[PDB]
Design an enzyme around this catalytic site. Structure first.
Site, PDB file in Angstrom:
ATOM      1  CB  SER A  74      -1.023   0.051   1.120  1.00 26.87           C
ATOM      2  OG  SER A  74      -2.109  -0.792   0.800  1.00 26.87           O
ATOM      3  CE1 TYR A 123      -5.619   0.618   2.969  1.00 29.64           C
ATOM      4  CE2 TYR A 123      -5.340   3.004   2.798  1.00 29.64           C
ATOM      5  CZ  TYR A 123      -4.851   1.711   2.645  1.00 29.64           C
ATOM      6  OH  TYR A 123      -3.599   1.471   2.189  1.00 29.64           O
TER       7      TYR A 123
HETATM    8  C1  LIG Z   1      -2.099  -1.973   1.437  1.00 29.36           C
HETATM    9  O1  LIG Z   1      -1.075  -2.391   2.048  1.00 29.36           O
HETATM   10  C2  LIG Z   1      -3.366  -2.822   1.402  1.00 29.36           C
HETATM   11  N1  LIG Z   1      -3.020  -4.192   1.047  1.00 29.36           N
HETATM   12  C3  LIG Z   1      -2.193  -4.618   0.033  1.00 29.36           C
HETATM   13  O2  LIG Z   1      -1.622  -3.819  -0.669  1.00 29.36           O
HETATM   14  C4  LIG Z   1      -2.087  -6.163  -0.178  1.00 29.36           C
HETATM   15  C5  LIG Z   1      -2.199  -7.053   1.128  1.00 29.36           C
HETATM   16  O3  LIG Z   1      -2.876  -6.594   2.071  1.00 29.36           O
HETATM   17  O4  LIG Z   1      -1.637  -8.211   1.157  1.00 29.36           O
HETATM   18  C6  LIG Z   1      -3.106  -6.585  -1.212  1.00 29.36           C
HETATM   19  C7  LIG Z   1      -2.796  -7.431  -2.318  1.00 29.36           C
HETATM   20  C8  LIG Z   1      -3.807  -7.786  -3.257  1.00 29.36           C
HETATM   21  C9  LIG Z   1      -5.133  -7.292  -3.099  1.00 29.36           C
HETATM   22  O5  LIG Z   1      -6.151  -7.595  -3.978  1.00 29.36           O
HETATM   23  C10 LIG Z   1      -5.445  -6.451  -2.005  1.00 29.36           C
HETATM   24  C11 LIG Z   1      -4.445  -6.108  -1.078  1.00 29.36           C
HETATM   25  O6  LIG Z   1      -4.239  -2.265   0.456  1.00 29.36           O
HETATM   26  C12 LIG Z   1      -5.565  -2.846   0.331  1.00 29.36           C
HETATM   27  C13 LIG Z   1      -4.116  -2.808   2.924  1.00 29.36           C
HETATM   28  N2  LIG Z   1      -3.373  -1.867   3.726  1.00 29.36           N
HETATM   29  C14 LIG Z   1      -2.808  -2.111   4.869  1.00 29.36           C
HETATM   30  C15 LIG Z   1      -2.085  -0.940   5.496  1.00 29.36           C
HETATM   31  O7  LIG Z   1      -2.134   0.138   4.836  1.00 29.36           O
HETATM   32  O8  LIG Z   1      -1.523  -1.146   6.610  1.00 29.36           O
HETATM   33  C16 LIG Z   1      -2.948  -3.486   5.433  1.00 29.36           C
HETATM   34  C17 LIG Z   1      -2.100  -4.084   6.317  1.00 29.36           C
HETATM   35  C18 LIG Z   1      -4.122  -4.248   4.882  1.00 29.36           C
HETATM   36  O9  LIG Z   1      -4.028  -4.165   3.427  1.00 29.36           O
END
Ligand SMILES: *C(=O)[C@](NC(=O)[C@@H](C(=O)O)c1ccc(O)cc1)(OC)[C@@H]1N=C(C(=O)O)C(=C)CO1
EC number: 3.5.2.6
Length: 356
Positions: free
Chosen positions: A61, A147
């Protein structure tokens, strides 16, 4: 590095690595505008490849910060305006619920409840259109923040339409190249594969999987040196030579909405500095936190006395970036294990508080 910087960095990170069982980590501290690097462990456990200043990590992210800045650059170029309705850039989006939803709402997760993730079942551009057409808002635009990668992801895809460039082409030419981020990629090329760390989840080596709007929400991979340059650029946008890029960076740090102690930028999130560590340390344990937002009308231009930050993760990586413009201070933490966000923020706070 100066012994002070060295000492706080090591006494904070070594216990973190041990407590969270992180296989590999790289940290950069920007102090008075100069970068200092640190690395620990392995990029690839099986091949015993260590983490180095050239190791690529999945930003997850934290990629949204690049998307926010690329969007800001497009606004500065006059190619798009945040006040434009989403349908101006995607005419096929004729569903009535989209009336009133602007690029600003998409970029700041305030469209009315777009989902945290684009469904994995969406594999085609046709699937994508159907997904957004059939989505049903839980709330009116501009009233609650949830988010969502499907929200900022769509913003990124639409923001580059006027230019005629693919999102990746636009990111490379308008952001990576001007900033000399020569080791930052949306698609890791073969020449760099040997430096691409493996992420680790439940002891298995893993790399992020392809997905709809992945480039736009979680697709960037970068090294600790390039991420330090990214923080330096966002710390002092006025030093950037490219006019629209300088403005785009500033726009990504403007405050568009407020929820409690936090303000939403484009990608970046901000709190007033000095900050109470509790207000931030303010976690991935909640799969969905819907929060009422107050619009900041008009948006407050980037405030130097702010704690600006972004956390990110993929299945096998965990990253965090935070900086304080007013102190020319910043930190980047990249690990190849997704570990608790509270641990990241606490570590980063102990380090930056000590250095300020
Ligand atoms: C951003 O980190 C976040 N998640 C991701 O980018 C990926 C993950 O959580 O493993 C991901 C990979 C593939 C997808 O279809 C969706 C997500 O964005 C959705 C979100 N953000 C977080 C943060 O900002 O701390 C998290 C820990 C949860 O995931």
């Amino acid at each position: 590095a100066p012994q002070q910087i060295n000492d706080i960095v090591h006494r904070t990170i070594t216990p973190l690595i041990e407590q969270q069982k992180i296989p590999g980590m790289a940290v950069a501290v920007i102090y008075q505008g100069k970068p200092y690097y640190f690395t620990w462990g392995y990029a690839d456990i099986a091949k015993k490849q260590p983490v180095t200043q050239q190791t690529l990590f999945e930003l997850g992210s934290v990629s949204k910060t690049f998307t926010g800045v690329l969007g800001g650059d497009a606004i500065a170029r006059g190619e798009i305006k945040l006040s434009d309705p989403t349908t101006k850039y995607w005419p096929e989006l004729t569903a009535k619920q989209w009336n009133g939803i602007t690029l600003l709402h998409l970029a700041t997760y305030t469209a009315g409840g777009l989902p945290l993730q684009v469904p994995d079942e969406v594999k085609s551009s046709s699937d994508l259109l159907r997904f957004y057409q059939n989505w049903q808002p839980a709330w009116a635009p501009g009233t609650q923040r949830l988010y969502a990668a499907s929200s900022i992801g769509l913003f990124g895809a639409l923001a580059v339409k006027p230019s005629g460039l693919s999102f990746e082409q636009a990111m490379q030419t308008r952001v990576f190249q001007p900033l000399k981020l020569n080791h930052t990629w949306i698609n890791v090329p073969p020449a760099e594969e040997k430096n691409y760390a493996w992420g680790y989840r439940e002891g298995k080596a893993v790399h992020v999987s392809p997905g709809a709007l992945d480039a736009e929400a979680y697709g960037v991979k970068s090294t600790i040196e390039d991420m330090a340059r990214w923080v330096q650029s966002n710390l002092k946008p006025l030093d950037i030579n490219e006019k629209t890029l300088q403005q785009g960076i500033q726009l990504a740090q403007s405050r568009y909405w407020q929820t409690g102690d936090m303000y939403q930028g484009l990608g970046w999130e901000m709190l007033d500095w000095p900050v109470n560590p509790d207000s931030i340390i303010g976690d991935n344990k909640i799969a969905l936190a819907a929060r009422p937002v107050k619009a900041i009308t008009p948006p407050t231009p980037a405030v130097r006395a702010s704690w600006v930050h972004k956390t990110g993760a993929t299945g096998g990586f965990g990253s965090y970036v935070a900086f304080i413009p007013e102190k020319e201070l910043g930190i980047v933490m990249l690990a190849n294990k997704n570990y608790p966000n509270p641990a990241r923020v606490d570590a980063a706070w102990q380090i930056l508080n000590a250095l300020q």
